[PDB]
Amino acid sequence: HDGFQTVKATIDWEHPMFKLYEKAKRNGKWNPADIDFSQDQKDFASLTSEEKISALPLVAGFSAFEEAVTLDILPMAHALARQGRLEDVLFLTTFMHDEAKHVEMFSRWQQAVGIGQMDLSVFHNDHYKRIFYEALPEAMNRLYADDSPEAVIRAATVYNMIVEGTLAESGYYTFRQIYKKAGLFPGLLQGIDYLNMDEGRHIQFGIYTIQRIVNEDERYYELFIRYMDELWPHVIGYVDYLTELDLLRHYVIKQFNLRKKQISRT
Amino acid sequence: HDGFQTVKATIDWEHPMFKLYEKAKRNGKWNPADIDFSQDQKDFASLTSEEKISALPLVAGFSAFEEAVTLDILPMAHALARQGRLEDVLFLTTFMHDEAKHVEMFSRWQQAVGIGQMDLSVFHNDHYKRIFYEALPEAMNRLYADDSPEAVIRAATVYNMIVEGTLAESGYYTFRQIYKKAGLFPGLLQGIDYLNMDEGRHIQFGIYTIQRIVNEDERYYELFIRYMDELWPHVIGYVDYLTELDLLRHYVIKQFNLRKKQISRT
Ligand SMILES: [Fe+2]
Ligand SMILES: [Fe+2]
Ligand SMILES: [Fe+2]
Ligand SMILES: [Fe+2]
Ligand SMILES: [Mn+2]
Ligand SMILES: [Mn+2]
């Protein structure tokens, strides 16, 4: 440690990520342990065997979505801390704790409805593993040895713009539509609503991070777009697998294109 | 990623660190942004120039205590995550966010009373830097390449048992005594009270971590005691410097001996 910013001076109170940190504390009070899952248990028990296995593929993708991102944000926090970006780090403590609650929430639902013992790994095909078992952890872990603008942009693209901002967002939108209409799983849907509010902040961090790097050299804009496209085939290839197993497809394309539009070449 | 625990099964609901994580969410709602510092500003302004410089040495040690530990817990989170200790990681998200609030709180006080511009690095002597600029970050950063029981015990000893559990605890106890008696700085003291409640949980993580490793091989008990003693000279050497510049001394010895007693050879 060369010194400490709050000894030499203070926090930068006007920093965008300090402002996001403040919002996260105000809006991040929900506790998954407070959700009543008593009705979700009766709902799941009421389902036919065939109706049961219809919910499980998305729920397997969910618990893994959340456990992966809980573990995989730590190298980003390390890299930004090493660059002295104290406000970013403060914000990322709320990011990481949010992901812990999301892991917790889905595991509490599984336990409540009685599928905790079932191994749901069956429902991750080849493209799902390419992203969540491979390209996500490789891009994040890179940052321990290579924190170049190229490496940070790629980490933020894979994690924030694709995993959270394209795939997970579409999955939760889809799952909510379906079961809100059925009147089923009110505990889980309240959980997803809280989760979606959290993830609004997470995507803003990804946008800020990519944009501040693009703002130094528009070459990085073309890197951003290329990594986005590089990843699309596996994004859709997981959708197809679930399908083979419609609205999920349409919303995913929309979200992917929206994320590109939130980054400006200049 | 080999798999995801909450896909294959669930969280271990009975794990001690899951229970500590639950407590942290219940008891970790305070927000430093809600503290009224209006009276602290008038108090500091009322002090004579000489009374002012009496508070500053401890406050410089404080803002650095907290900024160092915010950054320096990340390698422990990485190491335990790599070992698949999901419940420990969940808990450590509350640990890291608590430290962010502690950094924030002290920086908000400095800003409110009008010392934010002053560089307080003057008040870290040689032993303070040995611990906080050197031995703390080296022991934590080691865990990126060496997560052996020896390395984890040493990290937990330096960070949790010495930095937090011996020095910071004694400093806050001392500072509170003094100013509570004077009727001064009620905002700061409310901040320290909240901070002290948080740090109760942090020390329990350190104890759990050391004890679970000692429980595999009592050789590690003698390592624990030796690292504790290795560090004492610099612990007291910072006390002496502040003194030269009494109750702080007495409480520090007590806390040091208490921390050893919380680890059992068997
Ligand atoms: Fe997220
Ligand atoms: Fe395919
Ligand atoms: Fe702490
Ligand atoms: Fe000395
Ligand atoms: Mn999430
Ligand atoms: Mn602290």
Side-chain angles (χ1 to χ4, degrees), chain B residues 195-226:
Chain B
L195 180 155
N196 287 330
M197 291 168 52
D198 298 329
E199 294 301 329
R201 301 189 297 274
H202 298 185
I203 185 68
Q204 294 177 250
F205 166 83
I207 293 165
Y208 169 78
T209 296
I210 293 169
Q211 187 64 61
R212 79 173 158 79
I213 291 174
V214 170
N215 282 3
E216 296 157 339
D217 183 338
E218 88 191 339
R219 157 175 65 109
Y220 292 127
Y221 182 91
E222 299 299 329
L223 281 185
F224 167 66
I225 301 295
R226 182 164 81 250

PDB file of all heavy atoms in Angstrom, chain B residues 195-226:
ATOM      1  N   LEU B 195     -19.839   0.211  13.999  1.00  0.00           N
ATOM      2  CA  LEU B 195     -18.637  -0.459  13.551  1.00  0.00           C
ATOM      3  C   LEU B 195     -18.232  -1.585  14.508  1.00  0.00           C
ATOM      4  O   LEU B 195     -17.877  -2.687  14.078  1.00  0.00           O
ATOM      5  CB  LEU B 195     -17.525   0.579  13.421  1.00  0.00           C
ATOM      6  CG  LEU B 195     -16.172   0.150  12.979  1.00  0.00           C
ATOM      7  CD1 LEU B 195     -15.470   1.362  12.330  1.00  0.00           C
ATOM      8  CD2 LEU B 195     -15.332  -0.409  14.171  1.00  0.00           C
ATOM      9  N   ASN B 196     -18.239  -1.310  15.814  1.00  0.00           N
ATOM     10  CA  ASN B 196     -17.867  -2.342  16.783  1.00  0.00           C
ATOM     11  C   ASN B 196     -18.814  -3.546  16.715  1.00  0.00           C
ATOM     12  O   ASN B 196     -18.365  -4.687  16.847  1.00  0.00           O
ATOM     13  CB  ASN B 196     -17.850  -1.788  18.214  1.00  0.00           C
ATOM     14  CG  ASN B 196     -16.662  -0.876  18.502  1.00  0.00           C
ATOM     15  OD1 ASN B 196     -15.573  -1.018  17.925  1.00  0.00           O
ATOM     16  ND2 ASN B 196     -16.869   0.073  19.427  1.00  0.00           N
ATOM     17  N   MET B 197     -20.117  -3.327  16.514  1.00  0.00           N
ATOM     18  CA  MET B 197     -21.011  -4.483  16.386  1.00  0.00           C
ATOM     19  C   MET B 197     -20.641  -5.313  15.164  1.00  0.00           C
ATOM     20  O   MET B 197     -20.599  -6.549  15.235  1.00  0.00           O
ATOM     21  CB  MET B 197     -22.476  -4.080  16.268  1.00  0.00           C
ATOM     22  CG  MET B 197     -23.160  -3.479  17.473  1.00  0.00           C
ATOM     23  SD  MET B 197     -24.769  -2.776  16.954  1.00  0.00           S
ATOM     24  CE  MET B 197     -25.474  -4.209  16.088  1.00  0.00           C
ATOM     25  N   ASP B 198     -20.347  -4.655  14.030  1.00  0.00           N
ATOM     26  CA  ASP B 198     -19.910  -5.397  12.852  1.00  0.00           C
ATOM     27  C   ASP B 198     -18.675  -6.230  13.156  1.00  0.00           C
ATOM     28  O   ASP B 198     -18.572  -7.397  12.744  1.00  0.00           O
ATOM     29  CB  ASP B 198     -19.586  -4.472  11.660  1.00  0.00           C
ATOM     30  CG  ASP B 198     -20.771  -3.656  11.170  1.00  0.00           C
ATOM     31  OD1 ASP B 198     -21.921  -4.103  11.258  1.00  0.00           O
ATOM     32  OD2 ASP B 198     -20.513  -2.548  10.631  1.00  0.00           O
ATOM     33  N   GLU B 199     -17.678  -5.615  13.801  1.00  0.00           N
ATOM     34  CA  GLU B 199     -16.402  -6.264  13.998  1.00  0.00           C
ATOM     35  C   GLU B 199     -16.504  -7.458  14.938  1.00  0.00           C
ATOM     36  O   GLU B 199     -15.682  -8.356  14.834  1.00  0.00           O
ATOM     37  CB  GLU B 199     -15.365  -5.231  14.477  1.00  0.00           C
ATOM     38  CG  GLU B 199     -15.014  -4.133  13.403  1.00  0.00           C
ATOM     39  CD  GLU B 199     -14.469  -4.744  12.156  1.00  0.00           C
ATOM     40  OE1 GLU B 199     -13.826  -5.800  12.329  1.00  0.00           O
ATOM     41  OE2 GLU B 199     -14.623  -4.138  11.053  1.00  0.00           O
ATOM     42  N   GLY B 200     -17.533  -7.519  15.795  1.00  0.00           N
ATOM     43  CA  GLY B 200     -17.826  -8.758  16.507  1.00  0.00           C
ATOM     44  C   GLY B 200     -17.972  -9.964  15.590  1.00  0.00           C
ATOM     45  O   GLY B 200     -17.426 -11.038  15.855  1.00  0.00           O
ATOM     46  N   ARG B 201     -18.715  -9.812  14.491  1.00  0.00           N
ATOM     47  CA  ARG B 201     -18.816 -10.906  13.524  1.00  0.00           C
ATOM     48  C   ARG B 201     -17.499 -11.194  12.831  1.00  0.00           C
ATOM     49  O   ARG B 201     -17.189 -12.360  12.539  1.00  0.00           O
ATOM     50  CB  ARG B 201     -19.896 -10.597  12.475  1.00  0.00           C
ATOM     51  CG  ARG B 201     -21.246 -10.385  13.086  1.00  0.00           C
ATOM     52  CD  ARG B 201     -22.328 -10.305  12.012  1.00  0.00           C
ATOM     53  NE  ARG B 201     -22.085  -9.141  11.140  1.00  0.00           N
ATOM     54  CZ  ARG B 201     -22.512  -7.905  11.398  1.00  0.00           C
ATOM     55  NH1 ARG B 201     -23.242  -7.635  12.482  1.00  0.00           N
ATOM     56  NH2 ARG B 201     -22.229  -6.921  10.549  1.00  0.00           N
ATOM     57  N   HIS B 202     -16.730 -10.154  12.485  1.00  0.00           N
ATOM     58  CA  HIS B 202     -15.500 -10.376  11.755  1.00  0.00           C
ATOM     59  C   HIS B 202     -14.543 -11.238  12.566  1.00  0.00           C
ATOM     60  O   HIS B 202     -13.872 -12.113  12.029  1.00  0.00           O
ATOM     61  CB  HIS B 202     -14.815  -9.045  11.419  1.00  0.00           C
ATOM     62  CG  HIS B 202     -15.635  -8.159  10.545  1.00  0.00           C
ATOM     63  ND1 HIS B 202     -15.162  -6.954  10.047  1.00  0.00           N
ATOM     64  CD2 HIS B 202     -16.877  -8.321  10.061  1.00  0.00           C
ATOM     65  CE1 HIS B 202     -16.125  -6.392   9.332  1.00  0.00           C
ATOM     66  NE2 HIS B 202     -17.160  -7.207   9.309  1.00  0.00           N
ATOM     67  N   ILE B 203     -14.464 -10.989  13.866  1.00  0.00           N
ATOM     68  CA  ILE B 203     -13.524 -11.745  14.679  1.00  0.00           C
ATOM     69  C   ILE B 203     -13.967 -13.200  14.772  1.00  0.00           C
ATOM     70  O   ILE B 203     -13.132 -14.114  14.846  1.00  0.00           O
ATOM     71  CB  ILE B 203     -13.361 -11.097  16.067  1.00  0.00           C
ATOM     72  CG1 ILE B 203     -12.267 -11.837  16.869  1.00  0.00           C
ATOM     73  CG2 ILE B 203     -14.689 -11.131  16.855  1.00  0.00           C
ATOM     74  CD1 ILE B 203     -10.861 -11.625  16.264  1.00  0.00           C
ATOM     75  N   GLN B 204     -15.273 -13.453  14.761  1.00  0.00           N
ATOM     76  CA  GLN B 204     -15.773 -14.826  14.795  1.00  0.00           C
ATOM     77  C   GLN B 204     -15.385 -15.595  13.552  1.00  0.00           C
ATOM     78  O   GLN B 204     -15.181 -16.814  13.595  1.00  0.00           O
ATOM     79  CB  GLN B 204     -17.297 -14.840  14.934  1.00  0.00           C
ATOM     80  CG  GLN B 204     -17.824 -14.310  16.245  1.00  0.00           C
ATOM     81  CD  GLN B 204     -19.378 -14.301  16.268  1.00  0.00           C
ATOM     82  OE1 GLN B 204     -20.030 -13.232  16.243  1.00  0.00           O
ATOM     83  NE2 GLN B 204     -19.961 -15.492  16.265  1.00  0.00           N
ATOM     84  N   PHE B 205     -15.330 -14.923  12.410  1.00  0.00           N
ATOM     85  CA  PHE B 205     -14.812 -15.584  11.221  1.00  0.00           C
ATOM     86  C   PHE B 205     -13.346 -15.955  11.380  1.00  0.00           C
ATOM     87  O   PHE B 205     -12.931 -17.058  11.001  1.00  0.00           O
ATOM     88  CB  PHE B 205     -15.006 -14.679   9.998  1.00  0.00           C
ATOM     89  CG  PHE B 205     -14.210 -15.123   8.818  1.00  0.00           C
ATOM     90  CD1 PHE B 205     -14.683 -16.123   7.986  1.00  0.00           C
ATOM     91  CD2 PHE B 205     -12.968 -14.574   8.577  1.00  0.00           C
ATOM     92  CE1 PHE B 205     -13.911 -16.585   6.917  1.00  0.00           C
ATOM     93  CE2 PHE B 205     -12.209 -15.005   7.497  1.00  0.00           C
ATOM     94  CZ  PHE B 205     -12.689 -16.009   6.672  1.00  0.00           C
ATOM     95  N   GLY B 206     -12.552 -15.047  11.920  1.00  0.00           N
ATOM     96  CA  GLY B 206     -11.139 -15.344  12.125  1.00  0.00           C
ATOM     97  C   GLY B 206     -10.949 -16.524  13.062  1.00  0.00           C
ATOM     98  O   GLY B 206     -10.160 -17.442  12.795  1.00  0.00           O
ATOM     99  N   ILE B 207     -11.683 -16.520  14.174  1.00  0.00           N
ATOM    100  CA  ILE B 207     -11.628 -17.643  15.121  1.00  0.00           C
ATOM    101  C   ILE B 207     -12.035 -18.959  14.468  1.00  0.00           C
ATOM    102  O   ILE B 207     -11.334 -19.973  14.604  1.00  0.00           O
ATOM    103  CB  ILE B 207     -12.498 -17.332  16.354  1.00  0.00           C
ATOM    104  CG1 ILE B 207     -11.848 -16.187  17.099  1.00  0.00           C
ATOM    105  CG2 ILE B 207     -12.658 -18.595  17.252  1.00  0.00           C
ATOM    106  CD1 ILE B 207     -12.731 -15.498  18.129  1.00  0.00           C
ATOM    107  N   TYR B 208     -13.175 -18.986  13.788  1.00  0.00           N
ATOM    108  CA  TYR B 208     -13.629 -20.191  13.092  1.00  0.00           C
ATOM    109  C   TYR B 208     -12.569 -20.713  12.134  1.00  0.00           C
ATOM    110  O   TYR B 208     -12.283 -21.926  12.084  1.00  0.00           O
ATOM    111  CB  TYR B 208     -14.929 -19.909  12.322  1.00  0.00           C
ATOM    112  CG  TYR B 208     -15.331 -21.027  11.368  1.00  0.00           C
ATOM    113  CD1 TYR B 208     -15.951 -22.206  11.829  1.00  0.00           C
ATOM    114  CD2 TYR B 208     -15.055 -20.930  10.008  1.00  0.00           C
ATOM    115  CE1 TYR B 208     -16.241 -23.227  10.945  1.00  0.00           C
ATOM    116  CE2 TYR B 208     -15.346 -21.924   9.148  1.00  0.00           C
ATOM    117  CZ  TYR B 208     -15.948 -23.079   9.614  1.00  0.00           C
ATOM    118  OH  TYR B 208     -16.239 -24.060   8.691  1.00  0.00           O
ATOM    119  N   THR B 209     -12.024 -19.808  11.313  1.00  0.00           N
ATOM    120  CA  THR B 209     -11.033 -20.188  10.305  1.00  0.00           C
ATOM    121  C   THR B 209      -9.780 -20.804  10.949  1.00  0.00           C
ATOM    122  O   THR B 209      -9.263 -21.826  10.482  1.00  0.00           O
ATOM    123  CB  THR B 209     -10.683 -18.954   9.486  1.00  0.00           C
ATOM    124  OG1 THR B 209     -11.850 -18.520   8.791  1.00  0.00           O
ATOM    125  CG2 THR B 209      -9.592 -19.265   8.465  1.00  0.00           C
ATOM    126  N   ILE B 210      -9.249 -20.151  11.975  1.00  0.00           N
ATOM    127  CA  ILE B 210      -8.046 -20.669  12.614  1.00  0.00           C
ATOM    128  C   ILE B 210      -8.364 -21.986  13.315  1.00  0.00           C
ATOM    129  O   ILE B 210      -7.620 -22.972  13.195  1.00  0.00           O
ATOM    130  CB  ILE B 210      -7.461 -19.621  13.570  1.00  0.00           C
ATOM    131  CG1 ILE B 210      -6.949 -18.408  12.762  1.00  0.00           C
ATOM    132  CG2 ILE B 210      -6.315 -20.230  14.387  1.00  0.00           C
ATOM    133  CD1 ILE B 210      -6.600 -17.216  13.539  1.00  0.00           C
ATOM    134  N   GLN B 211      -9.489 -22.031  14.033  1.00  0.00           N
ATOM    135  CA  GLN B 211      -9.818 -23.220  14.811  1.00  0.00           C
ATOM    136  C   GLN B 211     -10.053 -24.425  13.913  1.00  0.00           C
ATOM    137  O   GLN B 211      -9.627 -25.542  14.250  1.00  0.00           O
ATOM    138  CB  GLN B 211     -11.033 -22.926  15.703  1.00  0.00           C
ATOM    139  CG  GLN B 211     -11.345 -24.083  16.678  1.00  0.00           C
ATOM    140  CD  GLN B 211     -10.215 -24.272  17.644  1.00  0.00           C
ATOM    141  OE1 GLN B 211      -9.889 -23.360  18.406  1.00  0.00           O
ATOM    142  NE2 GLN B 211      -9.550 -25.437  17.582  1.00  0.00           N
ATOM    143  N   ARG B 212     -10.684 -24.232  12.734  1.00  0.00           N
ATOM    144  CA  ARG B 212     -10.954 -25.401  11.911  1.00  0.00           C
ATOM    145  C   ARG B 212      -9.666 -25.984  11.356  1.00  0.00           C
ATOM    146  O   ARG B 212      -9.606 -27.192  11.090  1.00  0.00           O
ATOM    147  CB  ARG B 212     -11.955 -25.113  10.795  1.00  0.00           C
ATOM    148  CG  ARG B 212     -11.420 -24.422   9.596  1.00  0.00           C
ATOM    149  CD  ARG B 212     -12.470 -24.347   8.512  1.00  0.00           C
ATOM    150  NE  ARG B 212     -12.098 -23.254   7.628  1.00  0.00           N
ATOM    151  CZ  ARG B 212     -11.163 -23.347   6.686  1.00  0.00           C
ATOM    152  NH1 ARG B 212     -10.547 -24.508   6.442  1.00  0.00           N
ATOM    153  NH2 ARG B 212     -10.870 -22.280   5.967  1.00  0.00           N
ATOM    154  N   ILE B 213      -8.631 -25.152  11.200  1.00  0.00           N
ATOM    155  CA  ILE B 213      -7.340 -25.622  10.714  1.00  0.00           C
ATOM    156  C   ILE B 213      -6.533 -26.247  11.851  1.00  0.00           C
ATOM    157  O   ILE B 213      -5.915 -27.303  11.680  1.00  0.00           O
ATOM    158  CB  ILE B 213      -6.575 -24.474  10.039  1.00  0.00           C
ATOM    159  CG1 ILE B 213      -7.304 -24.129   8.739  1.00  0.00           C
ATOM    160  CG2 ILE B 213      -5.132 -24.905   9.694  1.00  0.00           C
ATOM    161  CD1 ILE B 213      -6.791 -22.952   8.029  1.00  0.00           C
ATOM    162  N   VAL B 214      -6.531 -25.607  13.020  1.00  0.00           N
ATOM    163  CA  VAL B 214      -5.897 -26.195  14.202  1.00  0.00           C
ATOM    164  C   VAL B 214      -6.488 -27.567  14.509  1.00  0.00           C
ATOM    165  O   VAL B 214      -5.765 -28.479  14.938  1.00  0.00           O
ATOM    166  CB  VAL B 214      -6.026 -25.217  15.391  1.00  0.00           C
ATOM    167  CG1 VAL B 214      -5.613 -25.866  16.723  1.00  0.00           C
ATOM    168  CG2 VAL B 214      -5.182 -24.006  15.145  1.00  0.00           C
ATOM    169  N   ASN B 215      -7.788 -27.754  14.260  1.00  0.00           N
ATOM    170  CA  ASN B 215      -8.484 -29.010  14.530  1.00  0.00           C
ATOM    171  C   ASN B 215      -8.001 -30.167  13.658  1.00  0.00           C
ATOM    172  O   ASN B 215      -8.363 -31.316  13.935  1.00  0.00           O
ATOM    173  CB  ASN B 215      -9.996 -28.842  14.317  1.00  0.00           C
ATOM    174  CG  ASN B 215     -10.680 -28.153  15.472  1.00  0.00           C
ATOM    175  OD1 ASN B 215     -10.034 -27.728  16.437  1.00  0.00           O
ATOM    176  ND2 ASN B 215     -11.995 -27.979  15.356  1.00  0.00           N
ATOM    177  N   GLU B 216      -7.239 -29.896  12.600  1.00  0.00           N
ATOM    178  CA  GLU B 216      -6.672 -30.946  11.758  1.00  0.00           C
ATOM    179  C   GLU B 216      -5.286 -31.384  12.206  1.00  0.00           C
ATOM    180  O   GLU B 216      -4.847 -32.474  11.832  1.00  0.00           O
ATOM    181  CB  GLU B 216      -6.560 -30.477  10.304  1.00  0.00           C
ATOM    182  CG  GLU B 216      -7.859 -30.171   9.617  1.00  0.00           C
ATOM    183  CD  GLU B 216      -7.685 -29.210   8.430  1.00  0.00           C
ATOM    184  OE1 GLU B 216      -6.664 -28.475   8.383  1.00  0.00           O
ATOM    185  OE2 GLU B 216      -8.566 -29.192   7.538  1.00  0.00           O
ATOM    186  N   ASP B 217      -4.580 -30.556  12.967  1.00  0.00           N
ATOM    187  CA  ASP B 217      -3.193 -30.838  13.314  1.00  0.00           C
ATOM    188  C   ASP B 217      -2.704 -29.795  14.318  1.00  0.00           C
ATOM    189  O   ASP B 217      -2.464 -28.634  13.960  1.00  0.00           O
ATOM    190  CB  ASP B 217      -2.341 -30.858  12.033  1.00  0.00           C
ATOM    191  CG  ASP B 217      -0.879 -31.227  12.280  1.00  0.00           C
ATOM    192  OD1 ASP B 217      -0.394 -31.071  13.420  1.00  0.00           O
ATOM    193  OD2 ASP B 217      -0.203 -31.660  11.316  1.00  0.00           O
ATOM    194  N   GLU B 218      -2.545 -30.199  15.582  1.00  0.00           N
ATOM    195  CA  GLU B 218      -2.167 -29.260  16.630  1.00  0.00           C
ATOM    196  C   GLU B 218      -0.798 -28.627  16.399  1.00  0.00           C
ATOM    197  O   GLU B 218      -0.462 -27.664  17.096  1.00  0.00           O
ATOM    198  CB  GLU B 218      -2.202 -29.956  17.990  1.00  0.00           C
ATOM    199  CG  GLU B 218      -0.902 -30.658  18.366  1.00  0.00           C
ATOM    200  CD  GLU B 218      -1.049 -31.553  19.583  1.00  0.00           C
ATOM    201  OE1 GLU B 218      -2.004 -31.342  20.363  1.00  0.00           O
ATOM    202  OE2 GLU B 218      -0.212 -32.470  19.756  1.00  0.00           O
ATOM    203  N   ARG B 219       0.003 -29.127  15.454  1.00  0.00           N
ATOM    204  CA  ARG B 219       1.175 -28.363  15.027  1.00  0.00           C
ATOM    205  C   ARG B 219       0.774 -26.939  14.678  1.00  0.00           C
ATOM    206  O   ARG B 219       1.515 -25.988  14.939  1.00  0.00           O
ATOM    207  CB  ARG B 219       1.846 -29.025  13.815  1.00  0.00           C
ATOM    208  CG  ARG B 219       2.704 -28.057  12.961  1.00  0.00           C
ATOM    209  CD  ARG B 219       3.459 -28.775  11.847  1.00  0.00           C
ATOM    210  NE  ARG B 219       2.569 -29.356  10.840  1.00  0.00           N
ATOM    211  CZ  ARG B 219       2.418 -28.912   9.590  1.00  0.00           C
ATOM    212  NH1 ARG B 219       3.101 -27.852   9.145  1.00  0.00           N
ATOM    213  NH2 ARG B 219       1.570 -29.536   8.780  1.00  0.00           N
ATOM    214  N   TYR B 220      -0.403 -26.782  14.076  1.00  0.00           N
ATOM    215  CA  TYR B 220      -0.869 -25.469  13.650  1.00  0.00           C
ATOM    216  C   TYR B 220      -1.152 -24.558  14.837  1.00  0.00           C
ATOM    217  O   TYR B 220      -1.008 -23.338  14.713  1.00  0.00           O
ATOM    218  CB  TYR B 220      -2.108 -25.644  12.761  1.00  0.00           C
ATOM    219  CG  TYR B 220      -1.781 -26.304  11.434  1.00  0.00           C
ATOM    220  CD1 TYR B 220      -2.465 -27.429  10.999  1.00  0.00           C
ATOM    221  CD2 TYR B 220      -0.763 -25.814  10.638  1.00  0.00           C
ATOM    222  CE1 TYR B 220      -2.146 -28.037   9.789  1.00  0.00           C
ATOM    223  CE2 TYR B 220      -0.434 -26.418   9.427  1.00  0.00           C
ATOM    224  CZ  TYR B 220      -1.121 -27.528   9.018  1.00  0.00           C
ATOM    225  OH  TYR B 220      -0.795 -28.106   7.810  1.00  0.00           O
ATOM    226  N   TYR B 221      -1.565 -25.114  15.979  1.00  0.00           N
ATOM    227  CA  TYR B 221      -1.685 -24.308  17.191  1.00  0.00           C
ATOM    228  C   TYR B 221      -0.385 -23.585  17.517  1.00  0.00           C
ATOM    229  O   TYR B 221      -0.392 -22.385  17.830  1.00  0.00           O
ATOM    230  CB  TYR B 221      -2.116 -25.175  18.381  1.00  0.00           C
ATOM    231  CG  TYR B 221      -2.298 -24.366  19.638  1.00  0.00           C
ATOM    232  CD1 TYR B 221      -3.538 -23.826  19.963  1.00  0.00           C
ATOM    233  CD2 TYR B 221      -1.223 -24.119  20.497  1.00  0.00           C
ATOM    234  CE1 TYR B 221      -3.711 -23.078  21.109  1.00  0.00           C
ATOM    235  CE2 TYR B 221      -1.386 -23.375  21.644  1.00  0.00           C
ATOM    236  CZ  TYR B 221      -2.631 -22.852  21.944  1.00  0.00           C
ATOM    237  OH  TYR B 221      -2.809 -22.098  23.080  1.00  0.00           O
ATOM    238  N   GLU B 222       0.752 -24.300  17.477  1.00  0.00           N
ATOM    239  CA  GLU B 222       2.023 -23.640  17.780  1.00  0.00           C
ATOM    240  C   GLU B 222       2.404 -22.634  16.705  1.00  0.00           C
ATOM    241  O   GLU B 222       3.070 -21.638  16.997  1.00  0.00           O
ATOM    242  CB  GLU B 222       3.145 -24.672  17.973  1.00  0.00           C
ATOM    243  CG  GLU B 222       2.902 -25.636  19.136  1.00  0.00           C
ATOM    244  CD  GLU B 222       2.802 -24.928  20.483  1.00  0.00           C
ATOM    245  OE1 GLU B 222       3.468 -23.878  20.659  1.00  0.00           O
ATOM    246  OE2 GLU B 222       2.054 -25.415  21.362  1.00  0.00           O
ATOM    247  N   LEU B 223       1.990 -22.855  15.456  1.00  0.00           N
ATOM    248  CA  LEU B 223       2.161 -21.808  14.452  1.00  0.00           C
ATOM    249  C   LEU B 223       1.363 -20.567  14.831  1.00  0.00           C
ATOM    250  O   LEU B 223       1.882 -19.443  14.810  1.00  0.00           O
ATOM    251  CB  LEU B 223       1.731 -22.305  13.069  1.00  0.00           C
ATOM    252  CG  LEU B 223       2.682 -23.187  12.267  1.00  0.00           C
ATOM    253  CD1 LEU B 223       2.115 -23.451  10.879  1.00  0.00           C
ATOM    254  CD2 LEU B 223       4.030 -22.544  12.142  1.00  0.00           C
ATOM    255  N   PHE B 224       0.078 -20.753  15.142  1.00  0.00           N
ATOM    256  CA  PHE B 224      -0.755 -19.632  15.555  1.00  0.00           C
ATOM    257  C   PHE B 224      -0.071 -18.817  16.646  1.00  0.00           C
ATOM    258  O   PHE B 224       0.119 -17.603  16.514  1.00  0.00           O
ATOM    259  CB  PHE B 224      -2.116 -20.141  16.031  1.00  0.00           C
ATOM    260  CG  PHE B 224      -2.920 -19.104  16.746  1.00  0.00           C
ATOM    261  CD1 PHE B 224      -3.386 -17.978  16.066  1.00  0.00           C
ATOM    262  CD2 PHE B 224      -3.214 -19.242  18.096  1.00  0.00           C
ATOM    263  CE1 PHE B 224      -4.135 -17.018  16.718  1.00  0.00           C
ATOM    264  CE2 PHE B 224      -3.955 -18.275  18.752  1.00  0.00           C
ATOM    265  CZ  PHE B 224      -4.410 -17.158  18.063  1.00  0.00           C
ATOM    266  N   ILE B 225       0.316 -19.472  17.746  1.00  0.00           N
ATOM    267  CA  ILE B 225       0.897 -18.720  18.861  1.00  0.00           C
ATOM    268  C   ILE B 225       2.147 -17.979  18.402  1.00  0.00           C
ATOM    269  O   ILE B 225       2.342 -16.801  18.724  1.00  0.00           O
ATOM    270  CB  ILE B 225       1.180 -19.654  20.055  1.00  0.00           C
ATOM    271  CG1 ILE B 225      -0.116 -20.335  20.526  1.00  0.00           C
ATOM    272  CG2 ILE B 225       1.829 -18.878  21.216  1.00  0.00           C
ATOM    273  CD1 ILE B 225      -1.168 -19.387  21.108  1.00  0.00           C
ATOM    274  N   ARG B 226       2.970 -18.617  17.567  1.00  0.00           N
ATOM    275  CA  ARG B 226       4.217 -17.982  17.150  1.00  0.00           C
ATOM    276  C   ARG B 226       3.987 -16.761  16.276  1.00  0.00           C
ATOM    277  O   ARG B 226       4.688 -15.748  16.425  1.00  0.00           O
ATOM    278  CB  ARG B 226       5.093 -18.990  16.415  1.00  0.00           C
ATOM    279  CG  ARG B 226       6.418 -18.397  16.014  1.00  0.00           C
ATOM    280  CD  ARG B 226       7.432 -19.456  15.650  1.00  0.00           C
ATOM    281  NE  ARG B 226       7.242 -19.949  14.287  1.00  0.00           N
ATOM    282  CZ  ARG B 226       6.798 -21.161  13.962  1.00  0.00           C
ATOM    283  NH1 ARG B 226       6.480 -22.058  14.896  1.00  0.00           N
ATOM    284  NH2 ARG B 226       6.685 -21.485  12.678  1.00  0.00           N
TER     285      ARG B 226
END
